[PDB]
Paper text:
[name], also known as [name]-32 or C9ORF114, contains a putative SpoU-TrmD (SPOUT) RNA methyltransferase (MTase) domain. [name]/[name]-32 localized to mitotic spindles and kinetochores, and its depletion by siRNA resulted in unusual centrosome detachment from the mitotic spindle poles, delayed anaphase onset, and chromosome segregation errors. Structural analysis confirmed that [name]/[name]-32 is a SPOUT MTase with a trefoil knot fold consisting of parallel six stranded β-sheets sandwiched between two layers of α-helices that promote dimerization of the protein. Our [name]/[name]-32 structures also reveal that [name]/[name]-32 dimerizes via a helical segment in the catalytic domain that packs almost perpendicularly against an equivalent segment from its dimeric counterpart.
To assess if the observed activity is specific and depends on [name]/[name]-32’s ability to bind its cofactor SAM, we mutated Ala356, an amino acid residue located at the centre of the SAM binding pocket, to Asn (an amino acid residue with a relatively longer side chain; [name]) and characterized this variant by determining its crystal structure and by subjecting it in our MTase activity assay. The crystal structure of [name]/[name]-32 [name] determined at 2.5 Å resolution, showed that while this variant does not affect the overall structure or the conformation of SAM binding pocket, the variant protein failed to stably bind SAH in the expression host (E. coli), confirming the perturbation of cofactor binding. We tested the [name]/[name]-32 [name] variant in our MTase activity assays and observed that this variant shows reduced activity, indicating that the specific catalytic activity of [name]/[name]-32 depends on cofactor binding. We tested the [name] catalytic variant in our siRNA rescue assays to check whether the methyltransferase activity of [name]/[name]-32 is necessary for its function. Depletion of [name]/[name]-32 and induction of [name]/CENP32 [name]-GFP expression in our stable cell lines failed to rescue the centrosome detachment and micronucleus formation phenotype. Thus, [name]/[name]-32 methyltransferase activity is required for maintaining spindle integrity. As expected, we also observed reduced cell viability for cells expressing [name]/CENP32 catalytic variant ([name]/CENP32 [name]-GFP) with reduced methyltransferase activity. These data together indicate that the role of [name]/[name]-32 in regulating spindle organization is dependent on its methyltransferase activity.
Numbering used by the authors:
A (entry chain A), B (entry chain A): 71 to 118, 136 to 373
The structure:
């Protein structure tokens, strides 16, 4: 299985926006930054919190394919500016008329005939029929059979792991989103039994990324502070009694030497930092 | 003299914004990207055009220190959303109460006494008096004398090259902005007699930036295409009869291998590309 990369950042960044419209745009900028770099997981953490819930909600809306949005998100006041947004244009976001090996779907909520598998809509012209009888409203990944009876009232396909499009066909297939009550929860509530075997924090107080060597790894995590830096969710977390955030991570880096602004915003810092790291990440995640 | 770096991009990117507010924010994102990376020059070029004039205007507003904005920009409808913007927080943007070796100023438009030098305001509590009698309304760079008669009705300082804060004290001191009628004007209308001795264009069609070696250089230029790529201002320019933009530049790079979005927006692409290049630029510009 290929390496994973997870990004963590505070919900509080949305409090800095200057209008609701831009509050939405900024959440959009995060999603795009993470998608461009093929991030597997985004962790929004409370820097000790509706900022966190809103940010996560937006992130999930944008990851979810369009044909599934009506079904998966009731109208909210967090998605009222959904429109003013940039698409991720990720490999799993396709038109109805686009031929593809795999497609996300939702299982229709119907009885079905006794032996028979579920009905799933993958935004194709016809529902897709499958192998198994699964609990409805649930989101799945379907691999469409290559032979498609030209007359059939449905298409046919098989449900598969959601890792398969990455691992089997090299395709980025979106991120997941995880809420964490604090900075220590970002590490502790990690989705891999494993642990995150490589953690990297960013700071203008850190060491030149040029002079950093990454250890071999399976699950990388990169953590961004707010406007107030990683110090704020570190002081404020009671499980962390430290005089500086350096020690929390395997590496602590400044990813933009000799910046010409006093401050880098975190939607800025995600692009710069992931760029500066991408080679590094690529050669160590072997 | 240290190396220079110039960024070029099309005005037409503003046509893609979805609201005037965001049209302004996006121009803001450009300025910030260029400031973070200490860019010396931004060239906005017409991809054969009010988009270009608006973008340039915004860029110049944001570079100009705040105490000089009233003086240098009449109220326009291009700066009506000036407010909804992010400051560059660049080394030449200081409070009135911030002690600094150098400060930008404007020469007051007054006669003065026959021998005597000009009056300049550098947003200090008192006007600054200088060495020379200069033509008024003109923008200058002032180095304040170290000894400051504590009673004097004015401070005293000397006008200096605007390169001095970079070259002498390592300080980023802003960019200039240049309009170009077409893609060939970006190269031809260059501000260095010299030429730009290193040109780099960006494309997902280009070669991995990992595998690129930069030649020694003095004046680098990096060029971004629109939504439609560099092809559009290349076909449309009549001085350029080529089947592909590769050949226009010394290097043609893809700066984000295996992206998980079909498209990178150019305010995105500036951050990623300059990051991916920064080391490279640093070691060749010796």
């Amino acid at each position: 299985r290929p390496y994973t990369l997870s990004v963590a950042l505070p919900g509080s960044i949305l409090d800095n926006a200057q209008s609701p419209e831009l509050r939405t745009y900024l959440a959009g900028q995060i999603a795009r930054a993470c998608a461009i770099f093929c991030v597997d997981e985004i962790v929004v953490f409370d820097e000790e919190g509706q900022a966190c819930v809103q940010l996560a909600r937006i992130l999930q809306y944008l990851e979810c394919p369009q044909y599934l949005r009506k079904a998966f998100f009731p109208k909210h006041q967090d998605l009222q500016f959904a429109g003013l947004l940039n698409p991720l244009d990720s490999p799993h976001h396709m038109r109805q008329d686009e031929e593809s090996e795999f497609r996300e779907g939702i299982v229709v909520d119907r009885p079905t005939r006794p032996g028979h598998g579920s009905f799933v809509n993958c935004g194709m012209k016809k529902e897709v029929k499958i192998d198994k009888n699964l609990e409805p409203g649930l989101r799945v990944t379907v691999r469409l059979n290559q032979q498609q009876h030209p007359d059939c009232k449905t298409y046919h396909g098989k449900v598969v792991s959601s890792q398969d499009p990455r691992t089997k066909a090299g395709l980025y297939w979106g991120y997941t989103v995880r809420l964490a009550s604090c900075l220590s929860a970002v590490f502790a509530e990690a989705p891999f039994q494993d642990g995150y075997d490589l953690t990297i924090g960013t700071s203008e107080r850190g060491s030149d990324v040029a002079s950093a060597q990454l250890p071999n790894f399976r699950h990388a995590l990169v953590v961004f502070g707010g406007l107030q830096g990683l110090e704020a969710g570190a002081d404020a977390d009671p499980n962390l009694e430290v005089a500086e955030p350096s020690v929390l991570f395997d590496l602590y880096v400044n990813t933009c030497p000799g910046q010409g602004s006093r401050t880098i915003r975190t939607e800025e810092n995600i692009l710069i930092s992931l760029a500066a790291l991408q080679p590094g990440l690529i050669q160590a995640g072997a």
